[PDB]
Design a protein around this ligand. Structure first.
Ligand SMILES: NC(=O)C1=CN([C@@H]2O[C@H](COP(=O)(O)OP(=O)(O)OC[C@H]3O[C@@H](n4cnc5c(N)ncnc54)[C@H](O)[C@@H]3O)[C@@H](O)[C@H]2O)C=CC1
Ligand SMILES: NC(=O)C1=CN([C@@H]2O[C@H](COP(=O)(O)OP(=O)(O)OC[C@H]3O[C@@H](n4cnc5c(N)ncnc54)[C@H](O)[C@@H]3O)[C@@H](O)[C@H]2O)C=CC1
Ligand SMILES: [Zn+2]
Ligand SMILES: [Zn+2]
Ligand SMILES: [Zn+2]
Ligand SMILES: [Zn+2]
Lengths: 374, 374
């Protein structure tokens, strides 16, 4: 039995920026009060994990990254009521405490207990459950899924259907839900509308899935990598455009294509310039632009506020606007009822031991999602 | 009588930036097809007219400015169906053609026939109806109300109640409707919410009126001129704050006052820095900030898009989001039924001939609205 004991297991540790992950033995402490220890089954490789490597997303190092995963509860600490040993779970990089002003609001989801805004790299109690070579290792977004076992706060875990296929539903822990909700919940895409989606990776494809589900008439995919276009069309894009093919700025191209601007635009890359391009291509009087991508730390964009004065709306969101603990189980149940597909997002499945290879696939442009299996 | 003939009348001509208006004789051509010639009765002095003088708002010179007014139809050109000679009317600085994609959209109000985005200073046909000293004079926003007579396109005029008091309802042509609609229609302020309003001039007072009408529980007025606070409180502000009194930036002050950020914020000044401050002071996960003020021409702001990623919504609007020709008559009807008050906005009355005194009152900070009578 492992309950109540330190577990020694394999994890991918990031010791410093711009280096490969190091796969090595770590010690995982047992869960304290209101904590849950989880045996990982599958974890996705998301661009946000790469942002930690590149220094785009700043978080204390050394760290165990990973935030898009599914696993099985190994043990629970004192006071836990929402999961039990053996339950299938998805860790939540955006928590849902249920008590703060945001959790109580009908349209907020960025719970005040999050570790995103001012990252400490710890459990809620300010300590870490991980050691490696005698040194404490930081957590990442209260999840740390690049490990055979992790410990999370109860407010950062959701119980899901016992029959769920974990090697697929791990994507509901980040990329699918983010993109899909960004369309259906944050933008509230309307039937008949024209949408433009900038960036055709895993999250961008999921935005397209949501735009199509919402009944958009036209969905224009935008990417500098034309190898992404075929899959974008498969999941609903009506047209794709490569900005490098044009002599004019792409906002001008898109405004012309849509006979005066799109209804909804989405920035799903993480570049300041594309955020402003995306806003500019939506119709000046009634367009809505949603920022999904994460830009480099501490950099400001420059924009003319006349773009907003005419009537545009600009907004952003974390995790598709979903309240995480309420929504994740419902999304998994919807998946099981065949309401959306996840297979189009999964291009590679590798053992956890090949994590660095998985990241190379992402960086070279070849993969959408690689799933790592434990 | 005068129908079909050139009218010689007095107008306030702006020959050059940063100079006083010149009150002098102009020739006003008769209306062409689908145009209306109006005898002005009252016009307000709005900060946007002053922006023309200062070069904040760029429009071709020389010009007859003025955009917030009411008058009586003198004659109609061929094909006009929506007004007749003798009708009381308000000119519309934002037109409503009824045919373009914006006019047909349920939310949009920034009609594609506007002269705001790319100002030409002409009638819809590209020509001027004004001459002074033998020289053509530009129009302003298709209205030009600083003249005893003006000519406007039919899509830029609304017929109002025959019993309307024109010296009050001129404010429905700009400042009242703008502020009130920015609250009730653009932001959609909710019952029980906390609002912050930056700028306590006529437009900002009207935002406060709208916030109160929508049932806000707290309305925090923000102005560097503490002489503005008494009237703000009279129309519904619960508290006022002067940024100059604080060592900390006012977004921090307001976030603290509202226990984590306000529900709705409004920028009603026209400064780049306050646009960003107003966005920052709304609650990071669910706050909404509306830009109403007009910024200096062609200048960009700088901001961190993480403000949006957390969940904030940023939007702007012209004319409070109201479809102009549909809305103005209804607003006047509602004023006549005592559904809102305009007197709190009107601090000074002057004859048209004292226009330059009226602008001096605005510039010194002493007035809210001065109404000029012809
Ligand atoms: N807001 C949230 O809650 C979340 C945000 N993220 C962020 O969303 C973004 C997308 O994530 P993934 O889809 O995993 O990334 P990805 O790297 O798989 O996809 C990005 C796509 O953008 C394209 N691209 C790069 N530069 C471009 C340019 N100038 N113009 C057009 N396309 C360009 C790439 O070719 C690529 O296909 C990342 O910034 C990530 O950090 C991810 C999930 C959650
Ligand atoms: N979006 C639209 O359709 C419309 C926009 N406008 C714009 O709305 C703005 C306000 O117009 P009015 O109320 O007529 O102007 P106003 O000049 O009477 O009022 C502006 C207020 O801002 C205050 N102020 C100046 N600097 C400040 C600072 N740093 N912090 C806090 N307060 C500051 C002033 O003391 C003043 O009371 C103008 O920019 C005008 O051009 C006016 C009507 C229509
Ligand atoms: Zn919470
Ligand atoms: Zn992610
Ligand atoms: Zn129109
Ligand atoms: Zn005005």
């Amino acid at each position: 039995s492992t309950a109540g004991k330190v577990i020694k297991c394999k994890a991918a540790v990031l010791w410093e920026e711009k280096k490969p992950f190091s796969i090595e033995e770590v010690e995982v402490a047992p869960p304290k009060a209101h904590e849950v220890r989880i045996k990982m089954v599958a974890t996705g490789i998301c661009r946000s994990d790469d942002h930690v490597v590149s220094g785009t997303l700043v978080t204390p190092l050394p760290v165990i990254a990973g935030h898009e995963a599914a696993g099985i509860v190994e043990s629970i600490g004192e006071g836990v009521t929402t999961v039990r040993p053996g339950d299938k779970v998805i860790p939540l990089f955006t928590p849902q405490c249920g008590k703060c002003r945001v959790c109580k609001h009908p349209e907020g989801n960025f719970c005040l207990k999050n570790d995103l805004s001012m990252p400490r790299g710890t459990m809620q109690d300010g300590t870490s459950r991980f050691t490696c070579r005698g040194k404490p290792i930081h957590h990442f977004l209260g999840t740390s899924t690049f490990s055979q076992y992790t410990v999370v706060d109860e407010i950062s875990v959701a119980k899901i259907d016992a029959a769920s296929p974990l090697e697929k539903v791990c994507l509901i822990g980040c990329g699918f839900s983010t993109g899909y909700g960004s369309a259906v919940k944050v933008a509230k895409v309307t039937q008949g509308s024209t949408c433009a989606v900038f960036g055709l990776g895993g999250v961008g494809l999921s935005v397209i899935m949501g735009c199509k589900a919402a009944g958009a008439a036209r969905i224009i995919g935008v990417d500098i990598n034309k190898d992404k276009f075929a899959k974008a069309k498969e999941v609903g894009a009506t047209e794709c455009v490569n900005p490098q093919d044009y002599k004019k700025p792409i906002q001008e191209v898109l405004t012309e294509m849509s006979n005066g601007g799109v209804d909804f635009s989405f920035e799903v890359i993480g570049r300041l310039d594309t955020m402003v391009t995306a806003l500019s291509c939506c119709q000046e009087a009634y367009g809505v632009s949603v920022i999904v991508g994460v830009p480099p730390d501490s950099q400001n964009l420059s924009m003319n506020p006349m773009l907003l004065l005419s009537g545009r709306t600009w907004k952003g969101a974390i995790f598709g606007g979903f309240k995480s603990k309420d929504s994740v189980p419902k999304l998994v149940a919807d998946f099981m009822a065949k309401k959306f597909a996840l297979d189009p997002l999964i291009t590679h499945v590798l053992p956890f031991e090949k994590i660095n290879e998985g990241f190379d696939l992402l960086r070279s442009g070849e993969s959408i999602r690689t799933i790592l299996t434990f």
